[PDB]
């Protein structure tokens, strides 16, 4: 795995020692090359994971996530170039180093073989994210949002740390391979119930769960564009990966313990999409959409069936790409008009047609138009839920309808109608912005052709 | 105070602690504590203020009561065993009295009330000596008598110390008081593992000492005793406030910073002894410490508070005095986590 | 100098001689105090510090040349003369910056006296700066809160330093001072009101002179008498102020003072007290921009001796 | 309440100074080279080449191998009259029931 890790580390000295003019260029070139290197990991043996060394291993679950992270860094750099132009060279380098440290921590999380190392780096990801939000946010609420995000995640994680140490003391190892191979069943006891809660709750906080999702809207609305990109694309999927890995230990008790979280997610997706129908802030709308999709993923994980897991992985990747692109599209309009209110900017299709096309494609993927990987994941989750219970289809279909409604409603309000007369600062979309939207879209449409890459290990 | 006299007083403090950590006879250990107090009191009053005198008086009264209780416990253990050696204590009442005395010396709650006041009264340098060096001797004594310690009393004091250290800090806008409450919480963390594994207490003490040394030296370099005076620092020495933010994050215990390893190892040892509820509560209660650390960071570095026009004058000048060990202390306080397995050296 | 130097046996008392004598020549605007101060310094062989101005620090740091007003001072005395009651708060900014400059000058002066044993002749001082503030407050140029902030800063800072041994006040009547200002011909200075000068004189005579007379003796001279510099020098040489702080001070107090004055930042530590007065509070964006501009100044990016731009060499081994 | 600089006007459009801005920076040269770097190393290199690399990635998933083994087993079991798929994953004899 060091083929990816060490160049990522070397990105930091290169960024620090590069000339003030060339920081973005050098970062982008080498991050794209690192992603090209990371593309090799997609080749996974069907029976067994790629165990590179004692510390690091990769499977068909970790590889798409690593590729997503490595692809996401250059996109974040392109998006964050514009609003950081006025910043001094040291501050821009510090921002880039926070991004690089975040990518490094995420790669090591997805590849770590030991649950305690996974926890250490998965909690380490908070520090760069918190610094980004609280230092380069543009509103006074960034401090409150950072506090909420940090404290929600830590309150979830600390019991996970205690439980992981207890597992190390009892079973004797936290290596995922050994745990999977030994994996003695749990018993229905209050001690085991609370171990299950401790293991599950940290990831349930990371994957915005209804009632634990309050941090996500504040964080995504208040963060800068790059921070929103990582939060939507990878930081939420950290919870999904953790839950999928950790579900091996808690085999039987999952059936009893899933019902609260299952019902919470199943109702919360409807509630959050209904919230999306009435949101007045574009970033907030996208955030609640992310909450709904992640609730679907939570349902898929809790069901613990092969089709559910495949759909969960597909939805994770597809949603990461779609949400990152949607945040980028919203950020462009925010830079142009300096407000996030949906109603303020109207009829932008006449002013910016290619951006309107990007918005159309992004919304179509968001509403899971086939054969998008979004729909592949969602449909697999729906079929798994139907096997779990035929009555799930009512809630799943209602959620799909509302997702279509709010996606096309955002598209209609922002990009259709009469142009706002008084706004005169709209200017032709830069090649950077269109390039960013294309870099988001083209991989997503391409992955439809070969879907086995993002269908996970159980494929 | 003449610098030769100041050096003699500091060497007397250090010699008292060395006698505490070196002697196998209880009378000499108590003598070392007495020397520590005698030498410490004028050091706390190097700069003569009414607050300095008040802090010295409070500290003297508290340490004098602690020493008297300690000597009574020693005398009772002598009465029931006839042994002067620091070893298993053969009378439970003497054990309880000695535990209370040593906790009062350490500032463990509910004997914590003097720590914030004394720290606020004395200067930043005296505060550094008080919150780093003075902790060594009582912790050494407790480690030597760990087996005799009744786990319930020590654990209750540790949990109360963590709770009170977390609570008090939230309400404080004075940097010295914040540091004192953080010290109380970390002392609770250290004394939590004392019944189980003393090496963990030593490791936590070393990490805490490095972090507090770094924080106090940064405060001295910035010459700030209040949150706003520290907020003004970004305009003058941005590197200082950036390093302060990193050290604060370490003190909160956030991974992958070095502040995480003492909490991690303490939780490990407690779980090995089937303690699950206690580590969970301690870890959750650390979030209050983390909160006021984060608020200080917001005030200092992450957010740019308004400066004053006269700061343009200070821009031209440079800091005259250099604290040599500050960079290494920062590095150890922040980036030593990849090197925990070396916790077998002090073992 | 350091604790080590004191341990090595460096004693300030031994170095201090009769020459050591902080002499402050004070007076109203255009009172001729500079001429007499210069003459006294020449005749008595004492260092002469010109009256502290907006860019006193600029002279004592770096190249020495004055910096831009935005970078250093952010205040204009000409603006004060033209627009005393400006909403910009330039009046109190100017007064506070002048007080800080005089604090730095007094520290530098004391450092010279302790390091060399040579007396220092100062044109006004921190102890006399309150006169201008009182005059502004009486005329309504500054608010009461500005006066309270100035009092806080003075109370915290000035107590540390030792007051001058000899105070020389050159007294010139206010109408003759107005005549002198007209003769000098400075356009901004001409706008000074008579009431402002009268309040300066009132503050001086009513407060500064008695308060200094309590500590030591004050030599008050008229304009004609001040012109006879040799007579003033003789009077100073025949002064005997046994009462006062300087006889009480010993080597310990001198060591503490020597240390304080050496650390200029420690001297100016409380001039930046976090009291958020509108006049002197600088917003975050403006503060950041001005700090960046100061950093971009030649020879200011790094610590002195490490700025390659201004010709420093051997940095890799320095 | 404070002396603060006036809020800067909306950041000057890069189009004004250089009409062919491309964005990515103020100076046109770095603009052009940043866009060339982005376009080349993303679209030309990563997207195209990596898409081919994934498309022709070796079937280490053993899909074709699984199909060939299934074909052999089906042919053999149909030829010998054995049932196509045995109901027991593991041989009953090796298992020792309680």
């Amino acid at each position: 795995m060091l083929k990816i890790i060490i160049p990522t580390t070397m990105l930091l000295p290169m960024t620090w020692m590069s000339k003030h003019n060339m920081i973005w260029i050098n970062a982008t070139v080498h991050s794209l090359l690192i992603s090209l290197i990371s593309l090799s990991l997609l080749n996974q043996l069907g029976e067994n994971s790629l165990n590179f060394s004692l510390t690091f291993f990769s499977d068909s679950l970790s590889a798409p996530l690593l590729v997503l992270t490595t692809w996401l860094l250059p996109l974040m750099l392109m998006a964050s170039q514009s609003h950081l132009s006025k910043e001094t060279t040291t501050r821009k380098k510090l921002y880039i180093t926070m991004l690089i440290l975040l990518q490094l921590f995420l790669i090591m999380t997805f590849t770590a073989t030991e649950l305690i190392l996974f926890y250490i780096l998965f909690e380490a990801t908070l520090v760069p994210t918190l610094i980004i939000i609280t230092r380069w946010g543009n509103q006074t609420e960034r401090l409150n949002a950072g506090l909420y995000f940090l404290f929600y995640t830590l309150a979830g994680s600390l019991p996970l740390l205690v439980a992981l140490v207890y597992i190390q003391n009892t079973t004797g190892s936290l290596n995922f391979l050994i745990i999977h191979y030994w994996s003695h069943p749990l018993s229905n006891s209050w001690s085991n119930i609370f171990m299950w809660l401790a293991c599950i709750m940290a990831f349930m906080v990371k994957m915005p769960l209804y009632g634990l999702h309050l941090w996500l809207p504040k964080a995504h609305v208040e963060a800068p564009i790059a921070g929103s990109m990582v939060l939507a694309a990878v930081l939420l999927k950290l919870g999904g990966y953790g839950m999928m890995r950790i579900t091996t230990i808690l085999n039987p008790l999952t059936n009893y313990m899933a019902y609260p979280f299952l019902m919470l997610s199943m109702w919360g997706m409807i509630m959050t999409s209904s919230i999306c129908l009435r949101q007045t802030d574009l970033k907030s709308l996208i955030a609640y959409s992310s909450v709904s999709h992640m609730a679907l993923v939570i349902v898929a994980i809790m069901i613990q069936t092969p089709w559910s897991f495949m759909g969960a992985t597909a939805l994770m990747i597809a949603h990461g790409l779609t949400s990152s692109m949607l945040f980028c599209l919203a950020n462009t309009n925010y830079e142009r008009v300096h407000s996030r209110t949906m109603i303020l900017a109207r009829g932008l299709q006449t002013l910016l047609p290619l951006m309107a096309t990007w918005w159309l494609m992004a919304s179509l993927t968001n509403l899971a138009l086939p054969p998008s990987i979004n729909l592949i994941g969602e449909l697999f989750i729906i079929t798994a839920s139907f096997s779990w219970s035929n009555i799930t289809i009512i809630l799943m279909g209602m959620n799909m309808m509302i997702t279509a409604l709010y996606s096309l409603y955002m598209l209609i309000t922002t990009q259709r109608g009469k142009y706002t007369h008084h706004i005169n600062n709209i200017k032709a979309s830069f090649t950077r912005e269109n390039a960013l939207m294309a870099l988001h879209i083209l991989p997503l449409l391409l992955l439809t052709l070969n879907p086995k890459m993002i269908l996970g290990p159980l494929y | 105070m003449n610098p030769i006299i100041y050096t003699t007083l500091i060497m007397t403090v250090m010699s008292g602690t060395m006698l505490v950590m070196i002697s196998s006879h209880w009378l000499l250990i108590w003598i070392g504590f007495e020397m520590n107090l005698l030498a410490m009191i004028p050091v706390l009053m190097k700069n003569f203020n009414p607050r300095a005198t008040e802090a010295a008086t409070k500290y003297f009264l508290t340490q004098a009561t602690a020493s008297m209780m300690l000597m009574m416990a020693i005398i009772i253990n002598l009465l029931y065993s006839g042994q002067w050696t620091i070893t298993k204590m053969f009378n439970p009442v003497a054990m309880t009295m000695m535990t209370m005395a040593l906790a009062m010396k350490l500032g463990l709650s509910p004997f914590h009330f003097w720590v914030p006041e004394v720290t606020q009264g004395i200067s930043l340098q005296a505060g550094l000596l008080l919150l780093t060096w003075q902790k060594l001797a009582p912790l050494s004594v407790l480690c030597q008598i760990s087996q005799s310690i009744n786990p319930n009393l020590m654990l209750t004091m540790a949990m109360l110390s963590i709770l009170i250290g977390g609570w008090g800090g939230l309400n404080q806008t004075q940097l010295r008081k914040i540091m004192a409450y953080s010290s109380i919480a970390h002392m609770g963390w250290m004394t939590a593992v004392l019944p189980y594994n003393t090496t963990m207490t030593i490791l936590n003490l070393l990490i805490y000492i490095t972090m507090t040394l770094a924080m106090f030296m940064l405060l001295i370099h910035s010459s700030a005793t209040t949150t706003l005076s520290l907020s003004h620092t970004w305009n003058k020495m941005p590197v200082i406030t950036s390093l302060m933010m990193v050290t604060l994050l370490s003190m909160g215990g956030l991974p992958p910073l070095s502040g995480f390893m003492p909490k991690w190892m303490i939780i490990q040892e407690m779980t090995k002894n089937e303690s699950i509820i206690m580590p969970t509560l301690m870890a959750m209660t650390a979030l209050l410490n983390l909160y006021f650390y984060m608020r200080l960071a917001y005030s200092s570095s992450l957010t740019m508070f308004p400066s004053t026009n006269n700061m343009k004058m200070k821009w031209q000048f440079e800091h005259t005095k250099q604290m040599k060990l500050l960079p290494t202390m920062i590095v150890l306080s922040t980036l030593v986590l990849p090197m925990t397995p070396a916790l077998s050296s002090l073992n | 100098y350091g604790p080590l130097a004191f341990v090595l046996g460096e004693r300030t008392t031994r170095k201090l001689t009769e020459t050591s004598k902080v002499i402050t020549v004070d007076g109203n605007i255009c009172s001729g105090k500079g001429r007499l101060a210069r003459e006294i310094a020449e005749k008595l062989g004492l260092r002469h510090f010109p009256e502290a101005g907006i860019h006193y620090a600029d002279s004592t740091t770096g190249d020495g040349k004055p910096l831009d007003v935005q970078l250093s001072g952010n205040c204009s005395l000409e603006k004060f003369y033209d627009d005393p009651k400006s909403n910009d708060g330039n009046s109190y900014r100017l007064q506070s910056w002048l007080y800080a400059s005089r604090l730095l000058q007094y520290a530098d002066a004391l450092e010279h006296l302790l390091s060399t044993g040579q007396g220092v002749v100062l044109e006004r001082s921190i102890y006399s700066d309150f006169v201008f503030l009182e005059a502004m407050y009486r005329q309504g140029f500054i608010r009461k809160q500005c006066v309270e902030h100035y009092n806080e800063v003075k109370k915290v800072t000035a107590c540390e330093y030792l007051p001058p041994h000899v105070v020389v006040y050159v007294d010139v009547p206010v109408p003759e001072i107005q005549s002198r200002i007209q003769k000098k011909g400075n356009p901004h200075e001409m706008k000074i009101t008579a009431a402002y000068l009268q309040d300066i004189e009132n503050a001086y005579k009513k407060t500064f002179l008695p308060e200094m007379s309590e500590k030591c003796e004050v030599l008050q001279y008229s304009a004609r008498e001040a012109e006879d510099a040799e007579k003033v020098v003789e009077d100073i040489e025949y002064l005997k102020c046994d009462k006062g702080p300087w006889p009480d001070q010993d080597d310990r107090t001198f060591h503490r003072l020597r240390m304080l004055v050496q650390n200029k930042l420690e001297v100016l530590n409380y001039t930046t007290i976090p009291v958020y007065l509108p006049e002197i509070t600088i917003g975050a964006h403006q503060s950041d921009r001005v700090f960046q501009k100061f950093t971009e100044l030649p020879g200011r990016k790094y610590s002195p001796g490490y700025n390659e731009d201004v010709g420093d060499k051997w940095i890799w081994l320095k | 309440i404070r002396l603060q600089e006036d809020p800067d006007p909306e950041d000057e459009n890069l189009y004004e100074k250089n009409p062919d801005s491309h964005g990515y920076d103020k100076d046109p040269i770095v603009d052009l080279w940043n866009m060339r770097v982005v376009f080349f190393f993303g679209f030309s290199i990563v997207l195209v080449l990596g898409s081919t690399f994934v498309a022709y990635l070796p079937d280490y998933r053993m899909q074709e191998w699984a199909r060939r083994e299934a074909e052999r087993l089906v042919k053999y079991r149909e030829a010998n009259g054995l049932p196509l798929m045995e109901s027991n994953c593991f041989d009953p004899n090796k298992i020792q029931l309680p």
Binding site: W136, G137, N138, Q139, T140, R142, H338 | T173, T227, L228, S231, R295, S299, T303, M304, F305, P306 | P274, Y276, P278, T281, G283, A284, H285 | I1, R2, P7, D8, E10
Partner: peptide, 14 residues
């Protein structure tokens, strides 16, 4: 516009 920074009121709050 520009990133919000603490004003006199916010600073005085602490």
């Amino acid at each position: 516009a520009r990133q919000w920074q603490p004003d006199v009121e916010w600073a005085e709050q602490f």
